[PDB]
UniProtKB/Swiss-Prot annotation:
Reported modifications of this chain: Autophosphorylates when part of mTORC1 or mTORC2. Phosphorylation in the kinase domain modulates the interactions of MTOR with RPTOR and AKT1S1/PRAS40 and leads to increased intrinsic mTORC1 kinase activity.
The protein's assembly and partners: Part of the mechanistic target of rapamycin complex 1 (mTORC1) which contains MTOR, MLST8 and RPTOR. The mTORC1 complex is a 1 Md obligate dimer of two stoichiometric heterotetramers with overall dimensions of 290 A x 210 A x 135 A. It has a rhomboid shape and a central cavity, the dimeric interfaces are formed by interlocking interactions between the two MTOR and the two RPTOR subunits.
Tissue expression from the record: Expressed in numerous tissues, with highest levels in testis.
Family of this protein: Belongs to the PI3/PI4-kinase family.
Function: Serine/threonine protein kinase which is a central regulator of cellular metabolism, growth and survival in response to hormones, growth factors, nutrients, energy and stress signals. MTOR directly or indirectly regulates the phosphorylation of at least 800 proteins. Functions as part of 2 structurally and functionally distinct signaling complexes mTORC1 and mTORC2 (mTOR complex 1 and 2).
HEAT repeat locations: 1-31, 32-64, 65-102, 103-139, 140-180, 182-216, 239-273, 274-309, 310-344, 345-377
Disease as annotated in the protein's UniProt record: Smith-Kingsmore syndrome: An autosomal dominant syndrome characterized by intellectual disability, macrocephaly, seizures, umbilical hernia, and facial dysmorphic features. Focal cortical dysplasia 2: A form of focal cortical dysplasia, a malformation of cortical development that results in medically refractory epilepsy in the pediatric population and in adults. FCORD2 is a severe form, with onset usually in childhood, characterized by disrupted cortical lamination and specific cytological abnormalities. It is classified in 2 subtypes: type IIA characterized by dysmorphic neurons and lack of balloon cells; type IIB with dysmorphic neurons and balloon cells.
Subcellular location: Lysosome membrane; Endoplasmic reticulum membrane; Golgi apparatus membrane; Cell membrane
Record's comment describing the protein's domains: The kinase domain (PI3K/PI4K) is intrinsically active but has a highly restricted catalytic center.
Portion of the full-length sequence here: 17 to 549 of 2549
Protein name as it appears in the record: Serine/threonine-protein kinase mTOR
Length: 397
């Protein structure tokens, strides 16, 4: 109905939205629907979670091409003038998923915000960022009006005035452009290499890593494989040297550059196995003394050892001996990830690896131990005895 659904959405204005969606599905989808949508649109034209759950639950029955599109069009066009906080990206994704019942007019609702990509791109970049995220998730039809010029626009347009939204905007535009390209990169790479020489600067480094990932198919495979846990590729000296100088001298002028450098070192290492390797090795040697960053430092060390064979070969004693005394107290998943990724240096881990499993029972610890046993069955009985001891300590009493 309308009144009951309105009350459910009002309660969802606050775990309640999911219960409302489940109950609405169980009641109606087996066997009244448009009244709830009309009331929700009337209220929203002036809550979010419960109303969104109610709108998505009833989606996909009759085949509303314009009636639901028209109801969502007011909110879709309003989101362009006023861009909301971090909830805006997820809300746009939910709206785009719900309106994706197979209508063609959906290419027009976001098109009202599409012109902002050249017009606007907190009231300029974030609205287009949310629209781009929703479209690239469901259908980029509204923002894909310039697909030949998509690479040219994504080269520079993502540096618009946003603090947290700009990085997501770069990612959304890059994802849409990469998917379209699967369906002037060298110039952009050279420009990022030369002009690189701040918080509103690291977005450029993130896009450049995204540019290397999308415009190059060589670095895509390794980046996809390790992320779970033809001419332009030669000119690798300029960008790496510029980034190295930027990190070395002025990192935190206005440790965001540290995260950017760690990300770019991963892109260079996974791209093709110039000065980036030595520069990132020196960066990790410097970040060994860095505080409140060992969680990322261990992950970077593991990624470097897995990808860059030469970097870790001379770096045997510096890093691996540091984390061993810290993990036992209570994060350490990255250290175990590096240990497992080093082999997949053959019999060396047997002597010291015991304390790692002896630390305690954790689901992540169990997953790491299982992955090591599947990957490195050098001493299976050693794993078996520890497993028996842990299982006895747990369930025996």
């Amino acid at each position: 109905s309308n009144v009951s659904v309105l009350q459910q959405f009002a309660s969802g204005l606050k775990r309640a939205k999911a219960a409302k969606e489940l109950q609405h599905y169980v009641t109606m989808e087996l066997r009244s629907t448009r009244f709830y949508d009309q009331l929700n649109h009337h209220i929203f034209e002036l809550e979010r979670k419960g109303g969104i759950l109610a709108i998505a639950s009833l989606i996909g029955v009759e085949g509303g091409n314009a009636t639901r599109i028209g109801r969502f069009a007011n909110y879709l066009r309003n989101l362009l003038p006023s861009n909301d906080p971090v909830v805006m990206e997820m809300a746009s994704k939910a709206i785009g998923r719900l309106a994706m019942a197979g209508d063609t007019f959906t290419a027009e609702y976001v098109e009202f915000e599409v012109k902002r990509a050249l017009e606007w791109l907190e009231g300029r970049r974030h609205a287009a960022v949310l629209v781009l995220r929703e479209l690239a998730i469901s259908v980029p039809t509204f923002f894909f009006q310039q697909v030949q010029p998509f690479f040219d626009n994504i080269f520079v347009a993502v540096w618009d005035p946003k603090q947290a939204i700009r990085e997501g905007a770069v990612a959304a535009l890059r994802a849409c452009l990469i998917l379209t390209t699967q369906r002037w990169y060298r110039h952009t790479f050279e420009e990022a290499e030369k002009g690189f020489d701040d918080d509103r600067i690291h977005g450029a480094l993130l896009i450049l890593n995204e540019l290397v990932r999308i415009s190059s198919m060589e670095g895509e495979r390794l980046r996809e494989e390790m992320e779970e846990i033809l001419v332009e590729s030669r000119c690798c000296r300029d960008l790496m040297e510029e980034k190295f100088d930027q990190v070395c001298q002025w990192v935190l002028k206005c440790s965001l550059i540290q995260m950017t450098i760690l990300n770019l070192l991963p892109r260079l290492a996974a791209f093709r196995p110039t000065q980036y390797l030595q520069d990132t090795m020196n960066h990790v040697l410097s970040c060994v003394k860095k505080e409140k960053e060992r969680t990322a430092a261990f992950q970077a060390l593991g990624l470097l050892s897995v990808a860059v064979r030469s970097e870790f070969k001379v770096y045997l004693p510096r890093v691996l001996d540091i984390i061993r005394a810290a993990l036992p107290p209570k994060v350490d998943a990255t250290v175990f990830t590096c240990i497992s990724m080093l082999a997949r240096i053959q019999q060396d881990i047997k002597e010291l690896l015991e304390p790692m499993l002896a630390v305690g029972l954790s689901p992540a610890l169990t997953a790491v131990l299982y992955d090591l046993s599947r990957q490195i069955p050098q001493l299976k009985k050693d794993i078996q005895d520890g497993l028996l001891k842990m299982l006895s300590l747990v369930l025996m009493h």
